[PDB]
Symmetry: D2
Subunit: 339 residues, 4 copies
């Protein structure tokens, strides 16, 4: 009314859930009133306070009965394995951040939406072709607030999208192939063992190998940039850094370009979500950043052979914090326009 | 003559035991039981991040694997009562799932169609003898049904502690194992199912303190040392390969040279001796249960009192596996 | 008045000391010497794999760089005797190269066109006063020409050992530090210039035993413990962050609770206390020289005899540097 | 030209490549190393030969003796001369020198090994200039006629890329392409952030703690090995935290339409002792220590068709240490035998 604060719940207080909670501390229009995971409050409070890659929490965390206090404010913790059994409404939760990795579909996410549950769900991952998929500052205008389940896309999509959109808007994209050189994640095995999803490569020791893997980010780009539907494909190489990633795109364009023209087009597209740098940085320099995507002008190529051009553009992203920053921008916007 | 082994559980220990058994003449694996898709299991047997490519060929066939041109049965039974080990001539089972680590549970393999004996790859409880081969396998009389092969750290610590005890007498001591990360640590910070706030942390990106039971339970293997040793671990970012340091008080005054000589005199197939200044990668894949490193010995004398430091390397994977395979063969043969 | 400082060796310790000096009113850096160019040094100050992006502005200039609006000269002279520190008014040099850590080598900075005093960022031998801030900085009178800030491990071990000695009396002890790899280890197996067959090995892929003098030389810092402590190191694959374990015999019987309480009572800006079950990444960037961890304490009693184990964390980079800069600030203020 | 018909090899520089070449030669019929020259203390070198973090313990025994090593019961002289002109290679029967120091990677510098009491032929373990033929064994070793004095064995990445690019060219024709190698860290990167002597602001960074972009010369120089591809390929690298083992991705346009199945079949048909083929979904640790110069991975192939136009992606693994060493040792033996 005079000071609206929408109540949010987090399902899955993992890497994305905990970092989203950290960022929400500085968002006036939303607050987290309930966390659901599979463990006790002491474990969750400890993992919020201490973070290997993202540093100590900015404030105080104190375990209480049934939850924990953050800077004095109590947050309820439950441990319900089934979303239909989470009584989100008890804590006034209107929007659930679905961050477990197990309910990333329209049908699975709407298990949160019932009389004693929530009203809307933001999936912290691709959610299928039938949910609106949003990269903040690339296509968040597709939201009208009436949606029940939306997707924040993947980390790679949030990196690739502003870069591919800038190529499309300035030069026109014919086709392209992407490789993301990506930090290992919690879905890879720490040492060689049976991967629950049957992936023979994620079965391998993730901090000791270059591990090829599939990704849908390029194949599904049309959900975010319709004019690029079907034009991009890609894959990943997972490598031994615990967070921090980079996306390379090799494309053919509808117009001839120079390296200088490509770089200038990216700089002109820079905003809170898409950064620009000319410094020769490495992955540790992007851990914790707030851009969804950080274009690196030092890696651009335009190769001309017999009058034909291949164009290579490269952008950094902290698959943790870059994605989380985008997710929280989208949540904040969605909450404000919600209906 | 050949000892025919069945392996229940095809994780790290089961797979490496299978690999090691291929190089030990007169021991063979004739059945594997594990709940995982055999296509995943075959791939994990073929390719190993730390232990290298499989020495030979592995193909999935209906009913099991073809390994080096020979069929090996692979089943997926949840209940040991339903594994007809005896069909494949299995006399002894390596119980390496973690789910049957007691006398009563492991004896489920001993049935009308089952095995005769079981070795658990974990502490086994009060009615289960704990054996470190070449330190106390003489305790076996062959009438046992279920025994334990102890833990990887116990197999490293035991011959070193036994040599100190036999030569000089141990009063007390504290152990620290600087230990590779393992599968029970999280790859990245996240809720640990066992409730351990330190195993919850990214295991390949941190020095992680943790508890260990090897020193406090050493009396099961060396009864003279009951209650005399305590210990802890620091888990660090190598994917296999570990080192145990022991600081002890002794009943006799000693010199560094006398300590090193006692260790060399105790060397055997299970307890190696080196004077080369090696590092952890140099012990990946070794078949000693413990490799004493004379370059790290200290004897500190202050005001007539001595603290003694002895250090042994172990591949927490292959050193322990090699010890289990020695114990499997010996236990099966005593009948 | 503000004392002008020079840094020889703009390495891990040199750059982090520079970063901390930005927040110290009593000293300022007016000259850096290394073996490279300003572009390289400015880039390495800006971007730091383990300690994060620089807090402020950095711009390359001719002959140096501008940090937070202030130019600092950068030179490339490999021999200390040839560094004209006096041209930039430098009075005290931080000797942080790793190559000049003795009184005779460090005093080459002190001459008519050089500096007046040197702080070696490392053990510097038995003939230089060796200071762990908040354990023995009172030994300084300001007239010294060369002093040592000791090692990272000494700064971790000293307040912990001193608390045991003050409360209970130490008979003897052995220390192991489980320590991050450093720039002196090889990235991949190859000839180590110092001849160390273990530092020759790939440092981010091995547990690497190594000698350390931190315990054996504790008597330079805590004279009553001279000769009572010895130790060694295991270098392991983290790029910074370390932990020191000490196993000791004491002059009186203790409990775990009494040991932990004595450490808590000794806590100050240099010696922290925690009861949280932390891991090494949690101490990267801290400003304590030593962070005692009560969760790791043991007191083992067997047949009436006790072995006591106490454990303290340290960021071998930022913990040491925070101590070094406290010592430099104090030394500069009392300097004669 | 030894009476006993054994190819006698000298190694200048006992770094990673020199030590692994020595190791490989122990199992090569009719080839032996009879002299090693390196400035380092032989006790350090012997220890590094015995114990190897990524390539395992030496197969046999190594002992220091006066003037050299005894390796598996055989003496090998080890000297420490700074100048090739002062290495009397001929005294140890050495016909061919593996020049692996990085300090003599040109025709006139490497020819300092060829003198009155020196060697007859030199193989440089690096790009070597352009009065120096560049040889990837089993791709273009047919360019040697035996009259050459100094040749180059190219680089590790070139030995990976060459058979893969050659198979595309021979079967389909290459218009242009871009390569990225996701590559193990190497000894020229810093273990922790610090000044890089070569001036590379990215190699200055902690190599086992970062994804590190870097330039590479293999694609731009491919014309030295495959002349018809001169000017057609460019590339770059991402160095990542594994201590050995690398992978090369190539995205190319071709002169005719292809399918994934046709591309993979063409690679399988091109397989030989230097270029392997796999359909197993392996990871980098699985290729450590292999003897192929390049191992094509059919699981990673893409052929993307959009509005009738195709981009083709092909990927090959290599142990940037042992794959390259294996190729160098093949080239050493072959060059020595045609030189006679
Ligand atoms: N880590 C990244 O880089 C990244 C980036 C973008 C998107 N994502 C996506 O975010 C989601 C989570 O990824 P993450 O890396 O944070 O994983 P994570 O493993 O760190 O977190 C998952 C959390 O969910 C909990 N959980 C599992 N099942 C649950 C259940 N039935 N009910 C309640 N809690 C449950 C787990 O205990 C854990 O804390 C995935 O969909 C992932 O694809 C990850
Ligand atoms: N954990 C640590 O890294 C740590 C902690 C405490 C003390 N120290 C000690 O600090 C000192 C530096 O260690 P570091 O880790 O920062 O090493 P470093 O390699 O990061 O830095 C050394 C710097 O000195 C430069 N240099 C080398 N020789 C030089 C010369 N003749 N003249 C001018 N510059 C030269 C180098 O280019 C480099 O920038 C050593 O004495 C070390 O023992 C290190």
């Amino acid at each position: 009314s005079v000071d609206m604060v929408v109540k949010v719940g987090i399902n899955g207080f993992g890497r994305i859930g905990r970092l989203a909670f950290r960022r929400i501390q500085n968002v006036e229009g939303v607050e987290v009133t309930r966390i659901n995971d599979l463990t006790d409050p002491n474990m969750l409070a400890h993992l919020l306070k201490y973070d290997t890659t993202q540093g100590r929490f900015d404030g105080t965390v104190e375990v209480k009965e049934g939850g924990f206090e953050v800077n004095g404010q109590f947050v309820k913790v439950s441990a319900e394995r089934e979303p239909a059994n989470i009584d989100w409404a008890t804590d006034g939760v209107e929007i659930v951040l679905e961050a477990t990795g197990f309910f990333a579909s329209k049908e699975k996410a709407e298990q949160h939406i019932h009389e004693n549950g929530a009203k809307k769900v933001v999936i912290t991952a691709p959610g299928g072709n039938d949910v609106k998929t949003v990269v903040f500052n690339t296509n968040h205008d597709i939201l009208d607030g009436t949606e029940t389940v939306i997707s924040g896309a993947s980390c790679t999509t949030n990196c690739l999208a502003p870069m591919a959109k800038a190529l499309q808007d300035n030069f026109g994209v014919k086709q392209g192939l992407m490789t993301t050189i990506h930090a290992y994640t919690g879905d890879q095995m720490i040492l060689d063992g049976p991967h629950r999803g049957g992936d023979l490569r994620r079965a391998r020791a993730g901090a000791a190998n270059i591990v090829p893997n599939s990704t849908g980010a390029a194949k599904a780009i049309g959900l975010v940039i319709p004019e690029l539907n079907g034009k991009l494909d890609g894959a990943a190489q997972r490598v031994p850094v615990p967070t921090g990633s980079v996306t390379e795109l090799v494309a053919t364009l509808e117009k001839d370009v120079t390296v200088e023209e490509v770089n200038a087009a990216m700089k002109a597209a820079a905003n809170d979500s898409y950064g620009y740098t000319e410094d020769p940085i490495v992955s540790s320099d992007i851990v914790g950043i707030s851009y969804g995507s950080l274009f690196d002008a030092t890696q651009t190529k335009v190769q001309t052979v017999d009058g034909n051009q291949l164009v290579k553009v490269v952008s950094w992203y902290d698959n943790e914090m870059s994605y989380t920053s985008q997710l929280v921008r989208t949540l904040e916007y969605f909450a404000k326009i919600a209906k």
